[PDB]
Amino acid sequence: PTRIRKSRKRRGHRQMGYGRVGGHRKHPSGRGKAGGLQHKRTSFDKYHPGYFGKLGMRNYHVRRNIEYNPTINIDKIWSLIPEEQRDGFLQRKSTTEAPVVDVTRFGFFKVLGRGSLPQCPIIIKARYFSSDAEKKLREVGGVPLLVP
């Protein structure tokens, strides 16, 4: 709303906050980003390291759905099991009726190892594992599995 703005509080002041000595002119520094290596060098080095130059290999066309790679940690695995069933599985730490969790159905590929699991056997099927995700899973009685 125009009626609550700072600029309407300057009616009657000859110069709307821009000063008498300097004033308000068109483009006293130039337009846009120009000057970054000469007269704005003090600005560009203080706040934008690595703005100038080249770095690394280039790919003329990236395949966005090849490089896509979702991930899930082991501390998030038991929340994929619906709440109505988690209690019973913990109740009976079965080796012969352990829960099977296939994480690609939920849309993940690799399993990483942050966190910890409850003391309960469980089977996890995925496309790739990290080394300590496997280590913490075998510590619990679980098995990792690879799936198509």
Partner 1 sequence: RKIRRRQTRLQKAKAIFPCPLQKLRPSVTRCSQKFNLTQRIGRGFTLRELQGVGLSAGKARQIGIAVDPRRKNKSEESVARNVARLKEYLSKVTIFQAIQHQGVVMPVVNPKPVITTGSIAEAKKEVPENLFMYLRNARTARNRARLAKRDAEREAAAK
Partner RNA sequence: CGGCCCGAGGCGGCGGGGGCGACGGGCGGAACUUAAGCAUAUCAGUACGCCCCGGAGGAGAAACCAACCGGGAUUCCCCGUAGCGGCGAGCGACGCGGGAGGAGCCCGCCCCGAAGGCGCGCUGUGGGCGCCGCGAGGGGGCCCGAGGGCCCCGCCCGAGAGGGUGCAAGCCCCGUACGGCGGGCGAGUAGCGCUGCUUGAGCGUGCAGCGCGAAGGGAGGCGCGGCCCUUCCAAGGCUAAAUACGCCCCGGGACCGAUAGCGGACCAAGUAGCGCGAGCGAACGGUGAAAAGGACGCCCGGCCGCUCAAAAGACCUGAACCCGGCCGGCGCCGGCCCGCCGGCCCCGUCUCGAAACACGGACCGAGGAGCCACGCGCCGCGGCGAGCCCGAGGGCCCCGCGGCGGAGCGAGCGCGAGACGCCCCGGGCCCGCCGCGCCCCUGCGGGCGUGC
Partner RNA sequence: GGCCCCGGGGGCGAAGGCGGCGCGCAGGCCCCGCCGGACCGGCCUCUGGUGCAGAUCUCGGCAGCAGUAGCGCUACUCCGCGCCCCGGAGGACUGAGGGGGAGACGGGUUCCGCGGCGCCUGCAUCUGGCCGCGGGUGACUCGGGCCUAAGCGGCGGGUGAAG
Partner RNA sequence: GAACGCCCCGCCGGCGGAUGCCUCGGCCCGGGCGGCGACGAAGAGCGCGGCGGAGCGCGAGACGCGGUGCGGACCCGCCCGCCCCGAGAAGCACCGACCCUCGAACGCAGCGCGCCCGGCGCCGCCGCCUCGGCGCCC
Q: Which residues bind partner 1 (CB under 8 A)?
A: 65-66, 68, 80-82, 85, 94-102, 104-106, 121, 123, 128-131, 134, 141-146
Q: Contact between 139 and RNA (CB under 7 A)?
A: no
Nearer to Mg ion, 25 or 61 (CB): 25
Q: Contact between 18 and RNA (CB under 7 A)?
A: yes
Q: Contact between 146 and RNA (CB under 7 A)?
A: no
Amino acid at 39: H
Q: Which of residues 14-53 bind Mg ion (CB under 5 A)?
A: 22-23
C-alpha 104/C-alpha 126 separation (Å) is 6
Q: Contact between 43 and RNA (CB under 7 A)?
A: no
Residues 6 or more apart from 106 whose CB is under 8 A from it? 72, 80
C-alpha 116/C-alpha 103 separation (Å) is 17
User: Which entry of K ion, Mg ion, RNA, none binds 46, CB below 5 to 8 A by partner kind?
Assistant: none
Nearer to K ion, 30 or 115 (CB): 30
Q: Write a three-state SS string for 21-69.
A: CCCCCCCCCCCCCCCCCCCCHHHHHHHCCCCCCCCCCCCCCCCCCCCCC
Q: Contact between 22 and K ion (CB under 5 A)?
A: yes
What is the nearest approach in angstroms of Mg ion to the Cβ of residue 33? Answer: 15
C-alpha 116/C-alpha 119 separation (Å) is 9
Nearer to K ion, 32 or 107 (CB): 32
Q: Contact between 78 and RNA (CB under 7 A)?
A: no
Residues 6 or more apart from 82 whose CB is under 8 A from it? none
